[PDB]
Design a protein around this ligand. Structure first.
Ligand SMILES: *[C@@H]1O[C@H](CO)[C@@H](O[C@@H]2O[C@H](CO)[C@@H](O[C@@H]3O[C@H](CO)[C@@H](O)[C@H](O)[C@@H]3O)[C@H](O)[C@H]2NC(C)=O)[C@H](O)[C@H]1NC(C)=O
Ligand SMILES: *[C@@H]1O[C@H](CO)[C@@H](O[C@@H]2O[C@H](CO)[C@@H](O)[C@H](O)[C@H]2NC(C)=O)[C@H](O)[C@H]1NC(C)=O
Ligand SMILES: *[C@@H]1O[C@H](CO)[C@@H](O[C@@H]2O[C@H](CO)[C@@H](O)[C@H](O)[C@H]2NC(C)=O)[C@H](O)[C@H]1NC(C)=O
Ligand SMILES: *[C@@H]1O[C@H](CO)[C@@H](O[C@@H]2O[C@H](CO)[C@@H](O)[C@H](O)[C@H]2NC(C)=O)[C@H](O)[C@H]1NC(C)=O
Ligand SMILES: *[C@@H]1O[C@H](CO)[C@@H](O[C@@H]2O[C@H](CO)[C@@H](O)[C@H](O)[C@H]2NC(C)=O)[C@H](O)[C@H]1NC(C)=O
Ligand SMILES: *[C@@H]1O[C@H](CO)[C@@H](O[C@@H]2O[C@H](CO)[C@@H](O)[C@H](O)[C@H]2NC(C)=O)[C@H](O)[C@H]1NC(C)=O
Ligand SMILES: N=C(N)c1ccc(OCCCCCOc2ccc(C(=N)N)cc2)cc1
Ligand SMILES: N=C(N)c1ccc(OCCCCCOc2ccc(C(=N)N)cc2)cc1
Ligand SMILES: [Ca+2]
Ligand SMILES: [Ca+2]
Ligand SMILES: [Ca+2]
Ligand SMILES: [Ca+2]
Ligand SMILES: [Cu+2]
Ligand SMILES: [Cu+2]
Lengths: 715, 710
């Protein structure tokens, strides 16, 4: 269990140790992230940097030494003539002595433009807007009752969309202006503004274009003028500030059948049945470690069942929302969430709501756009829950008014969960473990939709959800890395299909038997195992070991994809270079340390020329027979918003993911070791014998009272 | 309750229909249990739904309760030309009449088409026992079991269907097995073809014999060749591999019970008879002995969504190396899918807190039979909030957290015809989303291992091949979105490529929303070849407050494909499986896509789904019916031993509100919690129901396992 520490995130202490070491190098001229100038040197991100798999596996499987522990440190070098972003690996931990180059990209010049936005930058943007929009002040008051200057409880706000321009190196953002009320995401005013904020001197920043209610205007002054001269068809918004605001979660309406009491709840009188210690988990047959990468999010590592490895890594790689729109902001929006620290917006899970009251809730620390490491309460939870459906059951009838036996095993699952709330949407990320060796990855979508100001032309790109509101059409796409090591590193990939044959009926020569047969297809090269959305995806996608089970069949795990995704952008066109993985519901690559990730934090702001292009992993078309393979999986769905998305998108029917299922891996059902199985047997002239291996439970316990903090701060 | 119009027959009603028929002396009725085929007997009695026209006038326009009737299926075997005839028996209470249903002029295979029965099995077993006497020593030597003086070491058989090569035949292949715990997985290597068509069991014959990859013609021939050394024979306390009993050890053993649901404040749904209320939901349900579970007159927010959602048929289509294997196309409505609803075990099949419901079936029985805990109805936490949001202030704090705990209402039954157990769910979420689901578990259909079998399945044990097969299920989904008259429409994303309106030298290539209308049935019949649109909408002409048509969306969760070749022989029985989705104009002559007869005459069945589409009717502003196929290929694997498990082995569909309600319909729920910050104090936790931490105990576990007349 101490071995799982190799996969563990950095502690508050280690984050501080790395930050202090960076600050001790006076030549870096490092300033705090909150300093409100772009022309500064700052440490933007610090997170644990996984050691090489070769070394980890020798540590884990061969008794060799613990690999050196390091942190990734991303430094924004704004305080120089040619600003750039450079990454380092800082180590060792404990006792940092060195910073070495990490992911160097020599000859690329747009790193500064590619960098994530930051709190300091937002503050300066708000300053830029307050000055630049002064001509529109009276316009603001007349059309909205809110303002940017001299506001207190009636402030305008903005939401920036990305990417930021039409080509690599640009940092020109469209901004959707909204009223800052409860659920402000759903309150666009009809104004959108394009700001060039590329220069490290914010005094050079300019609103270069203005869109209001269907027309472009060139500058704030021009719109002000034309409005003053009565030449603008404006939409005067009603006052927002008894009934709840449409964008509030507050209850309204009544069901015809009143519900006055709390619903059923999980109790756990015996406590957890899994063993969670640090980042190590044991649960029946299962053994795995986890981590929460601040940049990209949740990972489960070194996953075993039955004491045998199944997967070295399963991890979220990227999550995107690709929009169409009638407004410039809407037609600009391709959100890539790793560009926003998908793994560090893991905000507090509410006990009894976000996870069961019986869950184990876990804190973490993140250092992402911060002056010090920040404590995130209840960032993750781990819990066992009844699925409501038995894992297996059978009624063995005697067909004479009775039975020979009933047998059943109550359905339970272990769930590891976190969330990501960057801004409007809340994604819920689950890794789920079933007692029979099946594991499942799942994303659910909830929170607020990305929405723009209603005009009639908007109906070609979305749905009217309220008086002044359009929910823009978009597609959610998530990419997963699935480094399966089925019973070991060396695997192959094959598929199975049903194929009909047409033979002479062997017992009636005058007749035919047209019937299913089992067809196996082997795959030798990466390109053969790169399935595009147009291609027919076989029903059995198997990752196999050369080892056979006792019945002569190769030991395999099957990948089963649950998705409504499709090709969204045209392959090869401009920003689509950022998301070439989204060409493939499944693609298989040969493992490589230079190919651990399909995305990065830089992809959002330079989608034209990003540091990783997944398609390039397929270029060399490597042999994949008896090799360390990585499966990569795209899942997602088209979301055409509808009125039921107000105030929030709901989770029912809004999840996607995949299952990993053993297929001839174990000699028989691996859940047979469960002692929860019950078999009822008849007895002549008596009550039935209920055979158990664990006593019947009716015990009771109570969860702690509900609490919720809502703050996240350094400790 | 008006939902009584949809209710199944009570014990009293079943007895009343049976008594009435038995009082007609000219019918010459005898009990199902009488062990001759040359008898007249009432095979099945269940409630026969009135016409939708009359039901809606009763429900919606305050008119008379429709006439209540029973469907009665009579096997007329005691006549020169045996047949099956169905009757409408009514009225109820106090039956007077008996009216013949659905004639088929020119169809001659009625008797052959009829389901197998207990009495037919007793006669088959007698035939096998007699016909296999020459193989007695062969049986003992090769298996240690036999049919004679066998006691604890008896052979058994599993029949496959369909039963022959053409309409009118009744020639069944029988898989010989050792009768032990989980006998389904113990084939001996012997299969037997028996012609049992004549009403005189005296005429029944073993016409062919298959053993370990060779045909032998008769039991006598196999016996002689065995004696003469001319047969390649396979000669066949930890638990048996076919047993559920625990063995093996987890690396981290678990010794205590897992978490459980408690419901100290009682159910939050209201059940009165067959009528259910739950938050916004109102619906009725029935358990049709022939075809299985239905939900009817489904309402949310006082508005109708669907008149009927029902299981229509469930099939398992096999390939194989053995003749039984290559013969098997099971169609479970042919086995009374809805009357093998055996006892739900509290805590396992449904939560300990569930409401368990009994029912009565009259299917191949002498009297109506009580089935304890045949269905269950329960609310359970889903473990994922229906909605949640963390509204950050981006300065180390928050403006609010809002969340609604996930709960769902589940209505469940099962069907275990024999080896497999299907679990049938209809699931209702608080936001107006309903879901249908089937899960497969129980024992696989399996045959004797030879090397040749590996082309049609997987070796799962020493002597066992798990045959490859596809599961396909058909649902009838009579959506009545806000009313009877609807249209069908699909939406897709289509890209446009325009001049970037703020940078003219550049392009915007972006999503647009494309809407497709459908005017004729055939346009809305989607084959598995065709690309299925992402939005499948059934729409009312009514608009929501924002100008969009009020609709429900159908979202299918399936791995199905075309299995049999269209137009080829038995595929005639399952033409519906050509279509993941097809839409028809409502017709009283097309209430069902299958029947109890399809299994035993798949070549010339009484209902051919394809014919529903032949008139290619207008579906603009009509009473529409969606028909949905879901399923999956199952290539068996060793983890299916002793049973297939439910994780990942489920299919179904969702029905989702799409611009039907002005905003999220779950906003009426008082379970929502909002946490607000407070200046210089603790947070305000706003609730509309008090926090609850009460615990209580459920009923102690019990299980009966018998199903008898009352
Ligand atoms: C991104 O910015 C960093 C930091 O500004 C660059 O690294 C720095 O490169 C300079 C040379 O350009 C190094 O500074 C010093 O140069 C003098 C030359 O007179 C030399 O005598 C000193 O020994 C020293 O090297 C500096 O060491 C180095 N800083 C770090 C932290 O590595 C980096 O090259 C820029 N990247 C790109 C792609 O332009
Ligand atoms: C399976 O193969 C058989 C044999 O080739 C096909 O049967 C022939 O079908 C044609 C009509 O298309 C007839 O003219 C022949 O008389 C048939 N021959 C025999 C020997 O029966 C049959 O159609 C094939 N079926 C499928 C579904 O592929
Ligand atoms: C959220 O958690 C923080 C950390 O525990 C709380 O801060 C503490 O507040 C208590 C008052 O009950 C003081 O006794 C401590 O001195 C505080 N500790 C620190 C480190 O600041 C804070 O009260 C909680 N906030 C809410 C809204 O519940
Ligand atoms: C199936 O058998 C039934 C019962 O023998 C036949 O029904 C009888 O038909 C005769 C002559 O048409 C009538 O006089 C009787 O009233 C019928 N008896 C009953 C109980 O309805 C029927 O003709 C046969 N069906 C077919 C299609 O041949
Ligand atoms: C979108 O449309 C534009 C304009 O038709 C296409 O751009 C043209 O592409 C051809 C071939 O590459 C060039 O020779 C022309 O110079 C381009 N014209 C302009 C005005 O840019 C573009 O290829 C289209 N993109 C997609 C993905 O369909
Ligand atoms: C299953 O249920 C039946 C019906 O309730 C039980 O039969 C009853 O058993 C009690 C206890 O001896 C008798 O006094 C009653 O006369 C029985 N009632 C009927 C209608 O038979 C039966 O015992 C139960 N079986 C099992 C195995 O639990
Ligand atoms: N779905 C999307 N991609 C997305 C949608 C809208 C949006 O527009 C508002 C601007 C974001 C305002 C808040 O931005 C951050 C950034 C990083 C962290 C962090 N990692 N700590 C926390 C908050 C941004 C992203
Ligand atoms: N999957 C399949 N289709 C199936 C698989 C195997 C099988 O093999 C042995 C025969 C079954 C013996 C029991 O048959 C019945 C019939 C009807 C009822 C009823 N509805 N009451 C109850 C039991 C039968 C069906
Ligand atoms: Ca490669
Ligand atoms: Ca691998
Ligand atoms: Ca028609
Ligand atoms: Ca309808
Ligand atoms: Cu969405
Ligand atoms: Cu199956």
């Amino acid at each position: 269990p101490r071995k799982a520490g190799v996969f563990s995130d950095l502690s508050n202490q280690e984050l501080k140790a790395v930050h202090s070491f960076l600050w001790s190098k006076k030549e870096l001229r490092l300033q705090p992230s909150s300093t409100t100038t772009m022309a500064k040197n700052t440490v933007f991100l610090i997170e644990m940097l996984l050691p090489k798999k070769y070394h980890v596996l020798r540590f884990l499987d061969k008794g060799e030494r613990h690999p050196v522990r390091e942190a990734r440190a991303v430094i924004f070098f704004g305080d120089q003539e040619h600003p750039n972003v450079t990454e380092f690996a800082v180590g060792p931990l404990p006792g940092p002595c060195y910073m070495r180059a990490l992911s160097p990209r020599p000859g690329y010049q747009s790193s500064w433009a590619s960098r994530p936005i930051s709190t300091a930058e937002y503050a300066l943007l708000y300053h830029t807007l307050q000055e630049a929009t002064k001509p529109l002040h009276q316009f603001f008051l007349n059309t909205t009752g809110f303002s940017f200057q001299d506001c207190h409880d009636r402030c305008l706000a903005f939401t920036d969309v990305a990417p930021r321009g039409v080509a690599s190196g640009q940092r020109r953002s469209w901004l959707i202006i909204q009223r800052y009320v409860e659920g402000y995401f759903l309150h666009p005013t009809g104004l959108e503004l394009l700001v060039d904020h590329g220069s490290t001197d914010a005094g050079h920043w300019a609103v270069e274009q203005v869109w209001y209610n269907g027309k472009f205007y060139g500058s704030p002054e021009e719109l002000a003028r034309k409005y003053a001269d009565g030449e603008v068809d404006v939409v005067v918004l009603e006052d927002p500030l008894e009934p709840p605001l449409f964008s509030s979660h507050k209850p309204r309406g009544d069901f015809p059948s009143p519900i006055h009491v709390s619903g059923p709840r999980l109790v756990q009188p015996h406590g957890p049945r899994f063993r969670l210690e640090g980042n190590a988990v044991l649960y029946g047959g299962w053994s795995f470690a986890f981590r929460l990468r601040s940049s990209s999010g949740l990972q489960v590592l070194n996953v075993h069942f039955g004491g045998e490895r199944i997967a070295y890594e399963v991890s979220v790689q990227e999550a995107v929302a690709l929009y169409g729109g009638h407004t410039p902001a809407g037609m600009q929006t391709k959100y890539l969430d790793v560009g926003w620290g998908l793994g560090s917006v893991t905000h507090e899970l509410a006990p009894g709501i976000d996870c069961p009251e019986t869950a184990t809730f876990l804190d973490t620390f993140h250092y992402y756009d911060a002056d010090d490491p920040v404590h995130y309460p209840r960032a993750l939870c781990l819990f066992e829950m009844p699925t409501g459906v038995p894992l297996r059951r059978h009624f063995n009838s005697n067909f004479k008014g009775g039975f020979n036996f009933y047998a059943g095993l109550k359905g339970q699952v272990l769930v590891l969960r976190t969330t990501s709330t960057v801004y409007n949407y809340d994604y819920i990320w689950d890794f789920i473990f079933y007692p029979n060796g099946v594991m499942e990855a799942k994303m659910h979508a909830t929170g607020y939709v990305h929405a723009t100001f209603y005009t009639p032309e908007g109906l070609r790109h979305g749905t009217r959800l309220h008086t002044h509101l359009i929910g823009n059409i978009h597609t959610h796409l998530v990419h997963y890395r699935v480094d399966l090591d089925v019973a070991g590193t060396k695997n192959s990939f094959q598929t199975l299909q049903m194929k009909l044959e047409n033979i002479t009926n062997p017992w009636s020569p005058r007749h035919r038997v047209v019937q299913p047969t089992l067809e196996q297809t082997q795959y030798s090269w990466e390109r053969q195992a790169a399935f595009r959305f147009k291609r027919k995806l076989p029903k059995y996608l198997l990752f196999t070991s050369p080892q056979e089970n006792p019945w002569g069949h190769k030991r395999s795990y099957r990948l089963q994809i649950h998705s409504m995704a499709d090709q969204v952008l045209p392959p090869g066109w401009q920003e689509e270079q950022a998301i070439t993985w989204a060409r493939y519901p499944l693609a298989v690559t040969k493992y490589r340390e230079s190919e651990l990730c399909s995305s990065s934090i830089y992809h959002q702001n330079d989608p034209w020329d990003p540091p990783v292009v997944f398609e390039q992993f397929l270029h060399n078309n490597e042999n994949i027979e008896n090799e360390d393979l990585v499966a990569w999986v795209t899942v997602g769905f088209l979301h055409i918003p509808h009125s039921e998305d107000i105030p929030n998108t709901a989770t029912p029917g809004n999840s996607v993911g995949f299952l990993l299922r053993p297929f001839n891996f174990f000699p028989e059902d691996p859940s047979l070791a469960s002692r929860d199985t019950v078999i009822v047997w008849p007895r002549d002239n008596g009550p039935n014998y209920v055979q158990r291996w664990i006593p019947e439970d009716r015990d009771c316990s109570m969860p702690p009272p509900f609490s919720y903090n809502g703050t996240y701060r350094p400790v």
